[PDB]
Ligand binder design. Structure first.
Ligand SMILES: O=c1ccn([C@@H]2O[C@H](COP(=O)(O)OP(=O)(O)O[C@H]3O[C@H](CO)[C@@H](O)[C@H](O)[C@H]3O)[C@@H](O)[C@H]2O)c(=O)[nH]1
Ligand SMILES: O=c1ccn([C@@H]2O[C@H](COP(=O)(O)OP(=O)(O)O[C@H]3O[C@H](CO)[C@@H](O)[C@H](O)[C@H]3O)[C@@H](O)[C@H]2O)c(=O)[nH]1
Lengths: 432, 432
């Protein structure tokens, strides 16, 4: 119902406007806060000011137009000005893999220094909140230090507040999160973020900054582990002539086991799970730990796309000169994102084996071309792609794929499409 | 409410009266079936006829007395007579590890031959149901063959119907299972078991016998995997000075992740998880598969008790001649079962390092003596044990342990007891 009197409107900035940053910036404005965003790329800022998302995310264009109409969302000309105009800054810049697989923290360090400069100009207390996925210790270590080194002696507080948004449903996960984790460096940080999130109906857990940072890796690596476990069990089910999805239907009814994320197939792609899992392994190894399960998780994941190509190659009797399609290039359905896409990886493996490769995706073909260029043929109609190839690998289960005519084709199914069983030869990547 | 007319009373036999067999025998009788049980050990049968459970299981003595009073439960003088007097036989004998870690199937094979002899004497169709944890393929392979080889040509059907009972809550899991899995070798098998379970309100999934067998290993190994994952994450949390249980409180709120079985500590013992995990690995390796995650699961598990002893040894500056206690010998709370107990394993490691070892358990000390003999001192009062030792390892979180006085002691906590933090030195085995 009604808003209680004296219910404070917070002034928040967000640095880094990938899907995490732009969904928080828009969402906080729609929750009732004044938000100032900034990104290193001026064309992102220009597009966002115009109400035109630079990335595809269901419902974002309308949430953005609503946040802009409220007058509560704006964008700054520099990181420092966004910071100086607000009381807390969410750092949401990327943490891509470094060359040795550890987390690359240079983007977070530059954003923290910008925060320190804005604080110095503001002259009063500010909260620095790390939304970026960063190894435990980064918030009170690197970020607090980089901020202090620029802040000219102005006092501030830090907090880790990890994010759990999934691409494809980020706005819903923003408004209805399963839980909010606040790793506050002090009481004033904790009370400020509990205020920021007061309108969100979800459990709020306040803990140390290190614990909150570890929650994020433990969560993402455990999801990756369910997927790789389903694939390990699936290789076995496939040898037994059994349906791995029916097995995990029964496994998931146990009240101790989550029924989701046992979707065996080509494995996980996207810009999070592969690189967070690798960062987690490298971080543990830097402390002398073996990380044996987490490494196994990645070994299975890296194997699956090679196995899918080996199945196709065995069924066709070699791939050189053969006409082969890949259905699906986005890293999952309903995005145009190809980062770490298993479909792209499968196309490359096919190419490296002398196949003539055709690809389709309902959304990601422009992004995939950015990566594959003219090395493949891009087909606009997925049926037309099937009609042209001898063999096909299904790499993303777009709903339109369920209705295609696979009859007479050799199909290596990497995502479980029930209709594909009608094929002349059906090979499940991790099931019979 | 009322029982519909013509609601058939099934005649069922059970071979093998460990906790699975005796809980099914009693439970089926209480559901309304006529049950005939048998076990290779005549003293078990004699005790059960007298209403005296040979094993400790909460509520069993009363369920048994009720099943016996109904007149519906009896016990045979031989496996063959139990079989010949019924229409379906649940095989529930053990499947311990063989010398090379694979499943030992000799107990199941002998029970299946007995079933075949009873069928031959009966002269008409019978259902053979495998409740034993057996590798996929065993029901329609070894068991169907061993039955046919003795049945003299009498027709029969087979089914895998795995069991998911936990020790300590087996009667409740019997009456209120999360799901019933029926891997029927034909339609008549499926319809017979759906009848047997008609009064149990739970989802019933009918599938191939191989799929049902694989569900059981996938479920038990996945639970073991959660535990080992919590321990892998816990070694890391401990290096960070963080509380792993608070981390997995937050991880478990994700709607994709089951909140249970992330109890980091000394790892899993008991007669199921260690040997089923090892059987699963050996079964996959027999088909040429690497089983990398499942092996990692066991590597972490085998490490934890060694690590706990290493922590104690480091804190005390060597263990030779030192007086050290183990609190907890049962493999989990509320049983007297010590099979594969981590407490026993820790006592042995301590012994092998020249410690003078004291042990306590509220129930399992007689069973543990069967294993450790006079190599340790058995202490009746756990406080008295603490008062006598310099260092202690907590290996089973019996509720009475939460109230003890650990002040001034060196404690390596293997199970998360909050009160133990009052110790002079507190080392969590997998947390700070
Ligand atoms: O059962 C499954 C589920 C997913 N996937 C694959 O796993 C990858 C990741 O999928 P998803 O979790 O939807 O994508 P993200 O948007 O990368 O979301 C993850 O990464 C975000 C960034 O850290 C976290 O906030 C989210 O909680 C976590 O889901 C995709 O390639 C999926 O196709 C499977 O192979 N099998
Ligand atoms: O978070 C946890 C939970 C359990 N344990 C340990 O794991 C072992 C197994 O515990 P539990 O699952 O209670 O014992 P079981 O009676 O061995 O039950 C398992 O094995 C039965 C036999 O197959 C299956 O039916 C059950 O579903 C499965 O729980 C014990 O040593 C526990 O102390 C942990 O270390 N951490």
């Amino acid at each position: 119902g009604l808003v209680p009197r004296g219910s404070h409107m917070a002034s928040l900035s967000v640095l880094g406007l990938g899907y995490v940053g732009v969904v928080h910036a828009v969402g906080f404005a729609l929750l009732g806060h004044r938000v100032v965003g900034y990104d290193v790329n001026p064309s992102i800022v220009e597009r966002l000011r115009a109400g035109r998302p630079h990335i595809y995310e269901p419902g974002l264009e309308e949430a953005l137009g609503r946040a802009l109409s409220s007058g509560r969302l704006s964008f700054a000309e520099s990181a420092e000005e966004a910071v100086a105009a607000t009381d807390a800054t969410f750092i949401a810049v990327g943490t891509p893999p470094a060359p040795d697989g550890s987390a690359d923290l240079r983007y977070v360090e530059a954003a923290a220094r910008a925060v320190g400069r804005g604080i110095r100009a503001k002259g009063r207390w500010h909260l620095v909140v790390v939304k970026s996925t960063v190894p435990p210790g980064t918030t009170e270590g690197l970020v607090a230090r980089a901020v202090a080194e620029e802040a000219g002696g102005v006092k501030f507080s830090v907090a880790s507040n990890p994010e759990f948004l999934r691409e494809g449903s980020a706005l819903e996960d923003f408004f209805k999160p399963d839980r909010i984790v606040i790793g506050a460096g002090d009481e004033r940080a904790a009370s400020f973020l509990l205020d920021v999130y007061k309108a969100v109906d979800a459990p709020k857990l306040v803990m140390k900054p290190r614990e909150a940072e570890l929650v994020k890796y433990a969560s993402n690596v455990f999801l990756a582990l369910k997927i790789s476990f389903a694939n390990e069990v699936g290789l076995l089910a496939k040898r037994l002539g059994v349906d791995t999805y029916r097995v995990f239907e029964a496994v998931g009814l146990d009240k101790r086991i989550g029924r989701h994320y046992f979707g065996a197939g080509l494995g996980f792609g996207g810009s999070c799970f592969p690189k967070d899992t690798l960062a987690f392994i490298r971080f543990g190894e830097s402390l002398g730990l073996e990380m044996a399960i987490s490494k196994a998780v990645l070994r299975v994941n890296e194997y699956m796309p090679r196995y899918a190509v080996q199945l196709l190659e065995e069924r066709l009797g070699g791939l050189r000169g053969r006409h082969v399609g890949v259905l699906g290039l986005a890293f999952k359905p309903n995005t145009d994102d190809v980062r770490e896409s298993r479909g792209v990886e499968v196309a490359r493996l096919l190419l490296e084996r002398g196949a003539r490769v055709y690809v389709h995706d309902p959304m990601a073909m422009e992004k995939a071309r950015a990566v594959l260029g003219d090395s493949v043929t891009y087909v606009e109609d997925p049926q037309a792609l099937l009609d042209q190839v001898e063999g096909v690998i299904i790499a993303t289960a777009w709903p339109q794929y369920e209705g295609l005519d696979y009859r007479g084709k050799v199909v290596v199914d990497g995502r479980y499409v029930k209709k594909a069983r009608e094929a002349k030869i059906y090979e499940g990547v991790a099931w019979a």
